[PDB]
Each structure stands twice: as C-alpha cells, then as structure tokens.
C-alpha cells in the first residue's frame, strides 16, 4: 500500500533509515532528497528534557524509517509508495546438493581469528564447482562475508567493541554503515536508491576501498585529508552530529592530520565540542569555503595534542588517480 504523508518544510539533510539526527530548528513525515525524485520517511519524536536544575533544554530529533520514491507533491503533502527491501536467498541455495543439505549449518567462531573464514568458504560455497564460477567469487556477494570485511575497516577507525555494537541483520547493518561513512550528499542519495542490501554493502566497501581522499566539495580538487588519518575521539564513533550555540548541526569527522587549510583567528574554547581542545575555524586555501575546525590541546599531557574536525557537508570523497 501507499501512504498520505506530510513533508518536512525546513529539512536540509537526507535521513537514512535507522539514523538519529538533530535538526536546525527555526508523527511520521517525509524528507525529500533534492538534487529530487526520492526521499525517506523520518520520525520526529523528541520531547527530550535534560536536567541541569532550573534549565531543561529541549532538543528535537528525527529518525529515518522507510525509503520511498515520490509520485507527486501537493501544497505540503506527499502521496508516496514505500520502496521494499529486496532480500535474496543464498547464492548456493539454487545449486545445493541434497546430500550436502544436512551439512550446511556451521558451528560458531571463537571471537577474538582469520583462518576460520578459510573453512567457512570451503563449506558454504562448496557446490561452486557445479557452476561456472570459483569459490572466492561467491564470497564477494556473501552478505555475512561483506559485513566482516566492512567491520574490519571500521575497527581501524573506531576503537569500540565488535559485539552488539554493530547489528547482525544485513539490511540494518547496511543502513548503519551508510550513516557512518564520511560521504557527501549525492553518495547517500545513491545508496538510498539501492534496493538490495548486498549491493549496498558491496558499494559501501567500494567507497571505502576507492574513495580514500576527502576533498573540498566546493572547489572539487583540493585534498583535505585521507581515510588513513581518520580516528575516533568521541566515544560515539569518528563522526558524530554536534550542535553549535545557534543550533547548526555539524556531522564532524575527526582526523589526525588535515592539509590545504587556512585558520581564521586565534584558538577559542567557548562551546568546544571536545572538552580540553581549543577550536579554530578552518577554510580551504583555494576557495575559502568552511571545511571545519582545528582543535588544539590546552594542556600538554592530552593525547593527541592536535587534530582536526571536518564537517561532513563540506567534504567530497574522491578516488585518487
């Protein structure tokens, strides 16, 4: 079925299903992705009241739900049909031998291992010799294998647990990775259009393996930082949404070393998102577009002493030549 859903009249960011997002303030609505023919159903739920005695600041937040393809607008209301999740069976289920049907459930892994995936491949994709493709090719389309390959790279960025932290459901795992990668707006839109979670995981791995360089979105070619310098100082990952004194949301990716930037002014500590670090506005050395801030440790014992926080909207992932 389809739904008659209202439109958010002041939304800028595109919301991914399963992403919580503070908003710039001036029960299910629609958030379009204007290039302009797609969008996502967001849920404004927040009645949040923090408790600081006498002041209960009220923060508003939205969370993505279902994808859709817009049909027609009418002022704002939008009639839209929800795009389904295309869940596919195993690649070997078509050619699974009846004798090997019983020996298809594998015992669990002693989580710490790298040699376990060798026997995992030999067993799961054994009937590949019945087809015209090798064992390792089918692994490139195995959601469980793709998830571990993505999880391996994410552990190099964030130093957080590997258990319940990341969802096991591939359609949820795919949407989670989409909201964590430091990718531009058109890439998030391209991932939303993807129907199959396996394709979404394959492309998220492609983005990580190809789009290593992050550059200014305005002037295109101006390498700001690379994927190697990405690290996580905030316990909630390497890229978390912060709100400034006036209510502007900044999905700030923290990197060790950033280049080709100009500093505007002297370090300040007012409303610093990272306690104990003095922020200073950073701009592109070619087009003077705001890329982010530079944080310098006030005390000398802090580690790391200096790092950079780049806003996601000002970056453009590119593939080095």
């Amino acid at each position: 079925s389809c739904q008659v859903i209202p439109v958010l009249p002041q939304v800028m960011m595109i919301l991914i299903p399963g992403q919580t997002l503070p908003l710039q303030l001036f029960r299910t609505f629609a958030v379009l992705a204007y290039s302009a023919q797609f969008g996502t159903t967001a849920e404004i739920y927040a009645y949040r009241e923090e408790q600081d005695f006498g002041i209960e600041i009220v923060k508003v937040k939205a969370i993505g739900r279902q994808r859709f393809k817009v049909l027609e607008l009418r002022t704002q209301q939008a009639k839209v049909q929800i795009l389904p999740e295309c869940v596919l069976p195993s690649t070997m289920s078509a050619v699974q031998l009846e004798s090997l049907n019983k020996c298809q459930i594998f015992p669990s892994k002693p989580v710490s291992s790298y040699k376990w995936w060798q026997k995992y491949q030999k067993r799961k994709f054994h009937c590949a010799n019945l087809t015209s493709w090798p064992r390792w090719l089918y692994s490139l389309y195995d959601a469980e294998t793709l998830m571990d390959r993505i999880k391996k790279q994410l552990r190099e960025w964030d130093e957080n647990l590997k258990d319940d932290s990341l969802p096991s459901n591939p359609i949820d795992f795919s949407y989670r990775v989409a909201a964590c990668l430091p990718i531009d707006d058109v890439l998030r839109i391209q991932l939303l259009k993807i129907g199959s979670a396996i394709q979404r995981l394959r492309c998220e791995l492609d983005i990580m393996n190809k789009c290593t360089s992050l550059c200014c979105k305005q002037c295109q070619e101006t390498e700001i930082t690379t994927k190697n310098e990405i690290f996580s100082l905030s316990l909630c990952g390497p890229m978390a949404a912060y709100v400034n004194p006036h209510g502007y949301v900044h999905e700030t990716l923290t990197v060790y070393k950033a280049c080709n930037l100009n500093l505007i002014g002297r370090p300040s500590t007012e409303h610093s998102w990272f306690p104990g670090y003095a922020w200073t506005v950073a701009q592109c050395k070619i087009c003077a577009s705001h890329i982010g801030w530079k944080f310098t440790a006030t005390k000398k014992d802090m580690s790391p002493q200096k790092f950079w926080g780049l806003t996601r909207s000002a970056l453009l992932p590119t593939i080095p030549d």
């Binding site: 400034n244 006036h246 502007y248 300040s268 701009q283 705001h290 801030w293």
Partner: peptide, 26 residues
C-alpha cells in the same frame, strides 16, 4: 564582538568582513 559567524564561529572585526564569510556557507 557580535560580528562572528553563527554557523562556524569565525570572529571578524568588521561588519563587511563577516558578510563576505556568509557567502562561503551557501
């Protein structure tokens, strides 16, 4: 003074010097 950018917090000492920065946000 209050001639700072509301989006990033860049401190400019002139009224015009901040209006030029406002273009670098859109």
């Amino acid at each position: 003074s209050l001639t700072t950018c509301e989006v990033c917090g860049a401190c400019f000492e002139t009224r015009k010097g901040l209006s030029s920065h406002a273009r670098s946000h859109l």
